[PDB]
Amino acid sequence: RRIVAKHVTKTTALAMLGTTIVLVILQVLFTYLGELSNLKADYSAWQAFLYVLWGAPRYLYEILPISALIGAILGLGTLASNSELIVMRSVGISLWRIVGWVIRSALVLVLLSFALSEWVVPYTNERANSVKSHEVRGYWSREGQRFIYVDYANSQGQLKRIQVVDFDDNYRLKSVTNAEQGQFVKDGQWLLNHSQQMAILANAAKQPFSLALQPKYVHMVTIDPEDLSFSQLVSFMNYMREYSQVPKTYQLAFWKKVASPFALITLVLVACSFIFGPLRQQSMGFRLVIALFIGLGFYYLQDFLGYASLVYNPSPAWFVLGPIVLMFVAGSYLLYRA
Amino acid sequence: IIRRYLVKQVVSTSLVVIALLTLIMMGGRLIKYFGVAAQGRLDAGVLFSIIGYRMPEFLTLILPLGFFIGLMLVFGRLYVDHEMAVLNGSGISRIRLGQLLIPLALVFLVIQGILMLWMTPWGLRQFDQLSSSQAVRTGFDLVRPKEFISSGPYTIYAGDLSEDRKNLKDIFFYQDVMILAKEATRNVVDLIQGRRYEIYSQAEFQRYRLRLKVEALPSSKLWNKWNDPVIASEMGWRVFGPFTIVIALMMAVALCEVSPRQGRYYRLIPAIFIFASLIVLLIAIRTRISRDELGVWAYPAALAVYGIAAALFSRK
Amino acid sequence: QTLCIKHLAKNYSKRWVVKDVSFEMQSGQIVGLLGPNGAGKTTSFYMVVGLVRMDKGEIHLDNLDLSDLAMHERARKGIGYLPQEASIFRKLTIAENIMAILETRKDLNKQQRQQRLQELLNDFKITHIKDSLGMSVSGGERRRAEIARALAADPKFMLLDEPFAGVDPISVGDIKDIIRNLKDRGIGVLITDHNVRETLAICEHAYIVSEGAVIAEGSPQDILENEQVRKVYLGDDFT
Amino acid sequence: QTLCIKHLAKNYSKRWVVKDVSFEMQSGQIVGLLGPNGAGKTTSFYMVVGLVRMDKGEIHLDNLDLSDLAMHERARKGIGYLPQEASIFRKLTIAENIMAILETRKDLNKQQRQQRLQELLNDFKITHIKDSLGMSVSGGERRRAEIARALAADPKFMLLDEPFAGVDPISVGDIKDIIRNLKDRGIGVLITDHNVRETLAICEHAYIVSEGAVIAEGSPQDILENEQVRKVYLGDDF
């Protein structure tokens, strides 16, 4: 079967793309209205327009789940209200086959989300920040039993006012070394000048020692873990884990990123089950209102359980993959009720 | 009997919509506050008083929006189930139905006038003093597990964090005094099984004690002083603000004509944006009057435009 | 009194659904607006009622123009409307349904309004069910309550939309009796209906609207004997 | 093939709309499921199709229980459904509408699938609109294309819902001819219809359901001369 498959896939894909365009335009306008209150001498209306325009890929990435939900709702509602899904069943096409056809359209949005997160958002966000406001200062980090502090760090391998403190398994001091400038030549060792060490007293004009800081990740410490792309997030978490403890705010971001395609697919499945179930024979306006309510509820629930994952003991995997699994089960049951 | 029918229907659906909009709009704010409270930047025990003191602010927007949405829901229902064709077909126009709800619009106008003039300034005063009390948190209060927190001359680390913000584990403190403790309970904090170092002084210990707006002013003070543009803007906002209920009535009467096939909810999304245009225009007008750029007259100007537009559209 | 409709016209999507529909209906006369389905009889009926805006022509009531008047402005002139679908006030009692329209009358006081309500309930045999909600009644009782409510407005012409719709042959006779009572009450009745066989059984003047224009007029016997109607609407075999 | 249906029952708002409706059917036989509006003919018809879940009862098709199957699983067994409303695929052409179901057939290859869309178009006189969208055709042509599309699934029982709905007396003969052609094609037909005058003219065995139960059965001659039906549904003069 291909013609019915193309019909359903094309209708739902066009609905998803139309909802995507509408929601992206609406969020761009809404943020521009919000950004219009911060204009000043060096931040004109044109600058704030470019700031929200460069943030459009991020808004798109954030809309794609709810865009897919509303697109599935509208596309399947157009078919159901026209009594087309009834005659697809009258010939022997299951509910799950139609759901799979809609998931085929949702996979395009999943791939678009992947592409945006990997290659578009990390660049347009940097462009937006450069447009608005126009390397980390006072970088504090721990490497196992050693605590290192640098006042100024550069992505090209420059350090200023290095301070390293060592300890034992019993937490006893060995040497508190301080430097003025530092350079990066190889992993696990940095060249520096004005090398002053305590001893439990020593000085050296120039000598390198072992420290695990790497210039590749220095520009990511300022970036919030949510904003980081998946490749950046995984590389940074690996680097931190190999030398320190990864914060829970990074595990949470990793689990919200690895579970976004599954959340999108589950949301589309819930939309399909609602169209075949409770939202059958309802008007299109009511279907759209319920789709907005479900989108808001899902966004609020995922945000709250992300916040709750940072304060409660269990891993953020439970708090992120929990709602997705529960909504998939609910949608599958509503599809079983036919 | 028709007036009582409409009033009961509109009151019931408007209360339902107001409860829904309240739940949604301050659930978003409560979730955001809990997110802020998740990093320790806000006490978890006061984020309910924050919502309680911001009830009037959110209700100030919800009451016109709730009244407008309920009015369009009632009128769209009348259109869908053919109760309007027998009301129009008996000599009762849709404008006449809108005029039968003038007493209800006046009751809602009085309620929102109370909100604007008394409850919103009081709630904002309370919330502002509470937030000012919550902005002094520093040091061990903002610590997060497995991270470095810098607050002025203090650098703080915690290896673990309990569900409540007490009983720290694997504590590293920097000034220059270096303090490392296995445990710490909370600024007054008792450190258990810790070591203290000075940058060379070493002092081990078993226990240690470490000791490191015009929007809220009462309308009594705002009745006068119309000369000051900020004071005038706020007072005009409180005076001409409640009249969005009347505009929400004559706009919901205008944009409610819907077909039975289209549905009761067909016209809600296009018209909620039209009403949001009025609210956004009023907020922008407030901002400009606060800069002595527009003048107090811009409030009745915008109110009279959206109306003469709603009235003209309802009489086409 | 006579309702004179002349040269109705209305286009949808640049297609003239109705082209030069003109008919005359008097008070106390049952007139059936029939024709092929989708040929413009429903649109002409709605232009007479006022649901859809007129594009050409004029609707008069004894040299009184009603073309420019809205639906509610015609209703005060003596034109009533009974929707085909359930138009009862769902959460209002049947007595309250009739009274909500009786209170709009300016020529009745409370002492007369209550008597009129009691008489209307008694004439339609709904006095036993007068204390129940509109949404909790049978289809026949609901339709009788709607017809009683429409009479509370005291109309001079009735525009019945699809009266024999979803009606068993057991209840078609009761609806015939209702429409005959409306005729005997001094109220002209305009009927548009797909059920032509029973519509032609009470109307003494039927207008057949085909291709957007009136192609026939007269008593049902004339319509049945008409070759043009039997070629496009009624067919060779019909009785 | 016999579609035995036994003791249907369904309740709505704790009110049993259908109480013990039972009827049987054969292939190539027109059966009319008639009765007063809201007396359980529509709900029983839907439970036969599968739209409404069955609270009580059994549906058999040559000792093959379809009671627990879904709407699509019954349709794969040879049960067709034609909705009263416009159910054509609006954005697909008429030939695409027919082929969309012909591709569902597993016993037909690409070479012979075109043969059927050629014979199905010619049988229902919709060849001239084979390239036109389903949303831009007349009511009669759209209905013919819907029936041709339904026949593309090769059903054994075609359950027609309100076939004479909004149909002029000139074109009622066309619907009667279509239903008779369906009968001559080896397909049993189940008709539920408000228009009993014409429905009782093509059905060779009619079932009257009143108060949620079958109150009469037999040929239309027996249905007309039935005291209970005469009193409840048809009325003294008919």
Residue numbers in the entry:
A (entry chain G): 4 to 137, 145 to 210, 218 to 355
B (entry chain F): 2 to 176, 185 to 195, 204 to 216, 223 to 235, 247 to 350
C (entry chain A): 10 to 248
D (entry chain B): 10 to 247
Quote the study's own text.
To assess whether the conformation of LPS in the drug-bound structure reflects an on-pathway intermediate, we solved structures of A. baylyi LptB2FG bound to either E. coli or Acinetobacter LPS but now in the absence of 1. In both cases, the overall conformation and contacts of LPS to the transporter are nearly identical to those determined in the presence of compound 1. These findings are consistent with a mechanism in which compound 1 binds a pre-existing, LPS-loaded state of the transporter complex, identifying this state as a druggable conformation for antibiotic development. Although the specific sequence of events is uncertain, we propose that C-helix movement away from LptFG during the transport cycle permits LPS to bind in the intermediate transport state observed in the structure of the LptB2FG–LPS complex and that this is the state required for inhibitor recognition.
